[model samples]
Target: MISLIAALAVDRVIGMENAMPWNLPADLAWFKRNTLDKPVIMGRHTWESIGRPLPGRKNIILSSQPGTDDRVTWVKSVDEAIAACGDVPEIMVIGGGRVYEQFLPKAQKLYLTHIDAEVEGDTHFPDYEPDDWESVFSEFHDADAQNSHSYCFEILERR
Candidate 1:
C-alpha cells in the first residue's frame, strides 16, 4: 500500500520556506515513531530541506537530476520510486507540495496532522473531496501544559 504523511493548516498550507509552519512536539514524535525504518519517498526539495537521510529508513528521492548521496536512490519519476520500492508491502510518501501532488492519486492511505493555526505559505496540500476518504482513525490534540499548539492526527483510507 502507498500512504502519505504530512502536517497542514486548516487552510491547507503545508509549509513555508521549506520548514514546518507550526511547532508541535507531540506530532513530530508521532511522525517519527510511525515512519522510522520504513522506505520513504520524497521530492528533491524535501530531501534538501531535511539535509540528511533519516536513519534506519530507506531514503528514496524523486528528482529530474541525480543526487550524489549514497543513501539516496534517485528516481526520475514517481513510478520509479514505486519500482524502487519493489516487493515492500508498503511505502511512505513524505512531502513537499509537488511530491504530494504526484502521489496523491495513487495513495491508498493518508496520515495527516491538521494544525489549528494558519500561516501564509507557498506550498499547500492538494485538494481532495471529503467524500473520497473515510477516516479510519483520528485524535485531536489540544494545547496543554506541554504543548502550545493544537493539532489533529487523522488516518484515512480512500473510500
Candidate 2:
C-alpha cells in the first residue's frame, strides 16, 4: 500500500529551508520502527537531506532526470515511481513539499506528526480536506514527557 510519512507544524508548515526545524526523538524512533524494511519513495532533494540510503529499506528516489545506483531507484515521474514500487507492503513517501504533494493523492494511508506550534516556513503540506480522509488512530506525545517539542502521531486513511 502507498503511504505518506511527514511531520508538520500547526500552520501546516513543513519546512523553510528544505529541512525540519525541531528534533523529536520519539517521532524519529517511531518512524524508523514503522518504516523499516519497506520501499520508500522520495525526491532527489530529500535524499540529499538524508545524506545516504537508509539501511533495510529500498530507497527509490524520484527525479526528472536519470542516473544509476545499486541502492537507489531513480524514477522520472510519479507514475513511474508508483509503477516501479509495485505491490510492496508499504511504500513510504518521505520528502520535501513537491514530493509530498505528488504522492498525497496516491497514498492510501498517512502517518503524520502534527506539531503543536507554528513557525514561519516556505513549504507547506498539501491541502487535504477532512471529507477526504478519516482518522484511524492518534496518540499525543507531550514535550514535558520527553523534555522536547510536543507533537501528535495521527494515522489517517482515505475515506
Candidate 3:
C-alpha cells in the first residue's frame, strides 16, 4: 500500500523555498515515529531539503535525472520507485508539491498534520476528497512553547 505523509496549513500550504513554513516539534516527532524504518519516497527537492539520509528508512527518490555515503535510490517514475522499495508493509510518500500530486491517487492511507494558519507558500498540497476516505485516527493539539500554531494529526484510510 502507498501512504502519504505531510504537514500542511489550512490553505494547503506545504512549502516555501523548499522548506516548511512553520515549526511544530510535536508534529515532527509524530512524523519520525510513523516513518521510521519504512520505505519513504520523496521528490528531489524534498530530499535535498532533508539534507541527509533519514538513517533507518529506505530513501527512495522519484527523479528522472539521477544511495548511503552516496544511501538512496533514484528512479524515473513512481512504478520504479515502488518496485525499488522491495516488499514492505507500506510505502510512504513524503512531499514537495509535484510528487505529492502524482502519488495522490495511489495513496491508501494518509498521515496528515493540519496546521491552523493560512500561510503563504510557493508549493501547496493537492486537494483530496474527504468522502473518499475514513478517519481511523485523529488528534487535536494546541500550540505549546515548542510550536507556534495549533494543529491536528489525522490518519485516514481509503474507504
Candidate 4:
C-alpha cells in the first residue's frame, strides 16, 4: 500500500524552488505527526531542502543517480525503487509536485490540504479525482482578515 501527502494553494498548486510559501503551522504539525515512522518516498528536490535523513521514516530518496547508506537509499525513479521495498508493508509519497504526477495513481491513501491562497509557484498538484478515494478524514481550519488563505484538510483512502 502507499499514501501520498502534500499541501496546495488556491489554484490547486504545490510549491516551488524547494520551498513552501504558506503560513499554516497546523499543516506542518499535522504533516509532522502524520508521516512519522512511515516508509517515505520523495524526490530529489525534497532531498535538497532536507539535507539530513529524518530520524524516523525509512527514507526512500529518489535522485537521478545512486549511492547512500545508513537509513537512506538514492534511487533512480519510482518504478525502479518501488519494488526494492521487499520486506516493508507499505510506503508514503511525500514527493514535491514535480515528481508527484508520476505516482499519483499509485497511492492507496492521501493526506491532501487544499489551501485558500495563491503564491507565485511553478508546481501543481496532480488532479486527483474525488471518485478514486473515500474521505476518511475532513475538516476546515478557518482563519481570517484573510481574503483567500482559508484551507481545508482531507485524508482519503481507497474508494
Which candidate gets the maximum lDDT versus the true structure? 3
| Global lDDT scores for all candidate models | 0.88, 0.85, 0.89, 0.78
Candidate 2, 1-159: lDDT as tens digits? 789998888789988776777777888888898789888888888787888889988888988777556678888988888888788778889877899888887889999998887688888889887898899999997788563778899999998
Worst 10 residues of 4 by lDDT: 141-150
Q: Which pairs in model 2 have colliding backbones? A: none
| Rank ordering of all candidates by lDDT, starting from the highest | 3, 1, 2, 4
lDDT of 4 by residue, 1-159 (tens): 877888888676687677777778777778878888777788888877778887777788778766655568777878766876656666778878866788777778888887888688878888878788898888997776532367788998988
Residues 20-90 of candidate 1 have per-residue lDDT tens digits of 75778898898898889789999988998889999888899988886778877889987888999888877
Query: Where does candidate 3 stray beyond 4 Å?
Result: 67-69
What is the RMSD, in Å, between candidate 1 and the native fold over all Cα? Answer: 1.1
Candidate 3 TM-score over all chains jointly: 0.95
Alpha-carbon TM-score of each model against the true structure? 0.95, 0.92, 0.95, 0.85
User: Distance from true position, residue 88, model 3, in Å?
Assistant: 0.6
Candidate 3 residue-wise lDDT, 56-122, digit = tens? 8898887778532357878888889989989898999998799999999998999999999777789
Of the two candidates 1 and 3, the one with more favorable lDDT, higher being better, is: 3
